Symmetry: C2
Subunit: 387 residues, 2 copies
């Protein structure tokens, strides 16, 4: 079921896209802690930001703002559709805030009865009771007592099904532009544009969960930029802090104004230390050169995956965007993704799954070409052991 490391695989040190365990075994990291360490391990600029802000101020609570948070908010506002930002500590918290905001906006602007949230089968939005109920895997939301109601699930990429369930009582459509956990499935252009049009028609808010696909992962700062479809609310985490727990919810002034003092909050969220680190991360990722490199690097990975398939005949599809890569296993290898993952680890390469039938890769956005080649040769060796 779940993927867990045995007692003899405990990471102790990381540098760039290499990780060492307690026994001193070296691994190439194509997993990034599940798409989190977007600039690799102990990146000098992030370490510098951590250490310098760490000497100055870590935390004051939202009885105050702080300079790192202000600077980061400004950067996100200048670079995106956002006019207002809220910082939290995790993707789950950012999504909680987004879903509460869409609900509350509908309640105060339209009607307390405008509560339906449309979400998608196989969606992943976090593991809080509300976010896991918006998530589209019933196995993970069962067994915790009464779920928050008025959430409807339809298939990802099925625009007709969305049209069928939406109405004037709908407050939000929540979608991952690419479903990372859900087999690395990208929205089609017509589907994503269709969501925008339906939200406009029903006065519902379009919420993009970009926790996994945002902050450079796709080769644009946010995936919405690739599609040219602007959401009402967007969430970001993971890559945002490069390994430091931080998240953000982005929206407009008109929507943000539905909140009042006390509508939401967080003790740690908006943290000067977190925001100093996320600022350094942002300054590196949001450059033409790094964003270009993500596309170059994607093709380096894809060519290796194609070569592996040519030799071993294991993949039916290679998909994703930028450095979120999915490789779907052929029917002959249905349900074997975990076995390829563990074989990878034996061979000294860390990879991911995206369901039992899909290999996933989410390396550092600055992973060195030499590391791509070495790690993919290790992965080819692992595939050879499995087949």
């Amino acid at each position: 079921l779940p993927v867990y490391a045995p007692a003899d695989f405990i990471p102790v040190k990381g540098k760039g896209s290499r990780v060492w365990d307690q026994q001193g075994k070296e691994y190439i990291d194509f997993a990034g802690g599940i798409a989190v360490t977007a600039l690799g391990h102990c990146h000098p600029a992030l370490v510098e930001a951590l250490k310098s802000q760490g000497e100055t101020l870590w935390h004051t609570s939202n009885v105050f703002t702080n300079e790192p948070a202000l600077r980061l908010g400004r950067k996100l506002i200048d670079a995106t559709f956002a006019e207002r930002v809220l910082f939290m500590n995790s993707g789950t918290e950012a999504n909680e805030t987004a879903f509460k905001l869409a609900r509350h906006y509908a309640c105060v602007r339209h009607s307390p009865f405008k509560t339906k949230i449309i979400a998608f089968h196989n969606a992943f939005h976090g593991q809080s009771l509300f976010t896991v109920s918006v998530g589209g895997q019933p196995k993970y939301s069962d067994g915790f007592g009464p779920k928050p109601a008025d959430i409807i699930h339809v298939p990802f990429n099925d625009l007709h099904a969305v049209k069928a369930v939406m109405d004037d009582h709908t407050c939000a459509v929540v979608v991952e532009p690419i479903q990372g956990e859900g087999g690395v499935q990208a929205a089609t252009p017509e589907f994503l544009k269709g969501l925008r049009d339906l939200c406009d028609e029903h006065q519902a808010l379009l919420v993009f969960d970009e926790v996994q696909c945002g902050m450079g992962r796709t080769g644009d700062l946010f995936a919405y930029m690739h599609y040219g479809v602007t959401p009402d609310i967007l969430t970001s985490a993971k890559a945002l802090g490069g390994g430091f727990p931080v998240s953000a919810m982005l929206t407009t002034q008109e929507i943000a104004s539905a909140f009042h003092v006390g509508s939401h909050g967080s003790t740690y969220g908006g943290n000067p230390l977190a925001c100093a680190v996320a600022g350094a991360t942002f300054d590196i990722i949001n450059t033409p050169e790094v964003l270009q490199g993500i596309h170059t690097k994607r093709q380096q990975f894809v060519q290796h995956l194609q070569a592996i398939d040519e030799q071993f005949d294991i993949f039916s599809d290679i998909r994703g965007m930028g450095l979120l890569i999915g490789a779907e296993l052929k029917p002959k290898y249905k349900g074997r993704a975990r076995d390829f993952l563990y074989a990878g680890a034996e061979a000294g390469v860390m990879v991911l799954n995206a369901g039992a039938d899909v290999m996933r890769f989410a390396p550092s956005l600055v992973v060195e070409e030499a590391d791509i080649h070495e790690g993919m040769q290790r992965f080819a060796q692992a595939v050879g052991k499995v087949v």
Copy 2:
């Protein structure tokens, strides 16, 4: 700039802290403040404590992040420390108190579901409780103003008055999965559980096969002068949550329970960087000398508050435990806690409220005596300015 950038959910002081050391903080104009607020009971060892900075830098050049597929040495070490020092046999690490409480409440629900019945779902919680602002945690929280207006709430949560054991007895039954309580309600006016109430919750949970869940996010990690408040009371919960002071300012949290309960789902999760910092924090707080000092320091604060009341006739009650201090305003000053908070800031001291009727103090557990005296002189001056007008 705040109004131009952040969602309007906060009304931040009119100054911006840029630097902190110990219990002193400087704003952009170089104005120096004494910190009796601790970022709401978070910076339990003050700002930029050298041991915490050293842990941050050392782990920061080694390894920051692992996913929950893995453990890591800092998480293992912190888990061991918590297990050795408490009733816990298993520890799950998260980022925030809200997340720890989500985990605790989901675990109590799931344990009931799989060990008893899928119908065993009622959660008993208390008016004025604060457990976080996620949809589930705010619904377990006891302030309807904060849980209204987000659409359908997770159901099967019943609220009764804090400290009302009869009310708990009245609502509990075989369909009850949990009682959730803060041993001291920090946000809710700094109100401590009575001994009979807390022991009674334990007995009722035993009787009904429900789990007793202590939210020690605010009152834990040394705040009361014991490592956890449950230790003062001698009442052992089934599940306990911790955050705030745990990381001394770094975002980290923990859910503590037994092997029997955790099996329904010795450590799980934990950010290596967060856990390194929390390990250094734990090593300092969990010492006889620091814990003793929390009581000495409490009395230093309380004596000042008593002197302020003698001069100005403003407080009807001084309460709390250790370095969680509440001072309730007399009827003449009812609803005016915010006025004293702003006057405090103007006088160069950072304090808190706990509702509109109560002043709250949550300083560093190692706050220097000189800072206690200086900060309380500033607070006396602030009180003086307010009362001179009225």
